[PDB]
UniProtKB/Swiss-Prot annotation:
<comment type="subunit">
    <text>Interacts with EPHA3 (phosphorylated); dephosphorylates EPHA3 and may regulate its trafficking and function. Interacts with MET. Interacts with NCK1.</text>
</comment>
<dbReference type="GO" id="GO:0031904">
    <property type="term" value="C:endosome lumen"/>
</dbReference>
<dbReference type="GO" id="GO:0097706">
    <property type="term" value="P:vascular endothelial cell response to oscillatory fluid shear stress"/>
</dbReference>
<feature type="active site" description="Phosphocysteine intermediate">
    <location>
        <position position="215"/>
    </location>
</feature>
<keyword id="KW-0597">Phosphoprotein</keyword>
<dbReference type="GO" id="GO:0030971">
    <property type="term" value="F:receptor tyrosine kinase binding"/>
</dbReference>
<comment type="function">
    <text>Tyrosine-protein phosphatase which acts as a regulator of endoplasmic reticulum unfolded protein response. Mediates dephosphorylation of EIF2AK3/PERK; inactivating the protein kinase activity of EIF2AK3/PERK. May play an important role in CKII- and p60c-src-induced signal transduction cascades. May regulate the EFNA5-EPHA3 signaling pathway which modulates cell reorganization and cell-cell repulsion. May also regulate the hepatocyte growth factor receptor signaling pathway through dephosphorylation of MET.</text>
</comment>
<dbReference type="GO" id="GO:1903896">
    <property type="term" value="P:positive regulation of IRE1-mediated unfolded protein response"/>
</dbReference>
<dbReference type="GO" id="GO:0019899">
    <property type="term" value="F:enzyme binding"/>
</dbReference>
<dbReference type="GO" id="GO:0032991">
    <property type="term" value="C:protein-containing complex"/>
</dbReference>
<dbReference type="GO" id="GO:0030036">
    <property type="term" value="P:actin cytoskeleton organization"/>
</dbReference>
<dbReference type="GO" id="GO:0010460">
    <property type="term" value="P:positive regulation of heart rate"/>
</dbReference>
<dbReference type="GO" id="GO:0071456">
    <property type="term" value="P:cellular response to hypoxia"/>
</dbReference>
<dbReference type="GO" id="GO:0070373">
    <property type="term" value="P:negative regulation of ERK1 and ERK2 cascade"/>
</dbReference>
<dbReference type="GO" id="GO:0034620">
    <property type="term" value="P:cellular response to unfolded protein"/>
</dbReference>
<dbReference type="GO" id="GO:0005158">
    <property type="term" value="F:insulin receptor binding"/>
</dbReference>
<dbReference type="GO" id="GO:0019901">
    <property type="term" value="F:protein kinase binding"/>
</dbReference>
Length: 291
């Protein structure tokens, strides 16, 4: 693969930090005026991570429509993702409102609630079947239906009810619990197995709304998730799978959300995940589950 042999050329040349920062200099810049309004300051987890006005998810509440979330619309791949920050104590009803209004079927969570001794994310879903959550501001009810806790991830079925209309949807919650606290994983095998469990679930199907993906800021690990999924898709449909330039895909995603892929190490890991993932989607997954 030209991806694989450019990978080695970067590894032998030790120039990941340079490749990465070229990406940072070429990345798009668009205005974020709504994110920056004083009335929205307490709706943002980091003052330096904001959604572009042009691609932001608008809540359909009449008062304040703001939420720190971005629609990543990948035209050629024919896949959309919503990348958002980890909910704040005060934005958990906003988060489920978005899930409801965008008709999402899956929520992908790439961080632990606590990491490096701090809260990266509010406890926004119920932990016991018998103690559901009611979000009074957005009039939503969230019930844990089942958990399947595995080694490196946990899948949850949740029931989201619109208390106004009383419809209910099943939401699948995919929680990658194994990402180290200060580095990308040593092997992409665990991560690729997680991506493919999300794929198999149907939460990425075009019949549903965009999957909601978040980590703490919603740009780093979230960026890795969508970037590797989209490259594997394009490899699957392009007739010339060798032609997928992961850096040109990243810059296209960065038209929709700033800062996707936070470190040169994450960039290196995304290469690995795509390279390793291409080996399944071109002829040969059973050995990822093993390790």
């Amino acid at each position: 693969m030209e991806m694989e042999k450019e990978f080695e050329q970067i590894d032998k040349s030790g120039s990941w930090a340079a490749i990465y920062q070229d990406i940072r200099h070429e990345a798009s810049d668009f205005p974020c005026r709504v994110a920056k309004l004083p009335k929205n300051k307490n709706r943002n987890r980091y003052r330096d991570v904001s959604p572009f006005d042009h691609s932001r998810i608008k809540l359909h509440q009449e008062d304040n429509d703001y939420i720190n979330a971005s629609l990543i619309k990948m035209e050629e791949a024919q896949r959309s993702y919503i990348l958002t920050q980890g909910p704040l104590p005060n934005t958990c009803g906003h988060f489920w409102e978005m899930v409801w209004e965008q008709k999402s079927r899956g929520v992908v969570m790439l961080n632990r609630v606590m990491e490096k001794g701090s809260l990266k994310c509010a406890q926004y879903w119920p932990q016991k079947e018998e103690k559901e959550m009611i979000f009074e501001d957005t009039n939503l009810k969230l019930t844990l239906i089942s958990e399947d806790i595995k080694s490196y991830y946990t899948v949850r079925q949740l029931e989201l009810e619109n208390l106004t209309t009383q419809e209910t949807r099943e939401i699948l919650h995919f929680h990658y619990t194994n990402w180290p606290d200060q580095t990308a994983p040593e092997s992409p095998a665990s991560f690729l197995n997680f991506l493919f469990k999300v794929r198999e679930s149907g939460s990425l199907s075009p019949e549903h709304g965009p999957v909601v993906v978040h980590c703490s800021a919603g740009i780093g690990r979230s960026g890795t998730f969508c970037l590797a999924d989209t490259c594997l898709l394009l490899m699957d449909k392009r007739k010339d799978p060798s032609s997928v330039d992961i850096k040109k895909v990243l810059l296209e995603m960065r038209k929709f959300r700033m800062g996707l892929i936070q470190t040169a190490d994450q960039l290196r890991f995304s290469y690995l995940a795509v390279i390793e993932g291409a080996k399944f989607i071109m002829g040969d997954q059973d050995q990822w589950k093993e390790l």
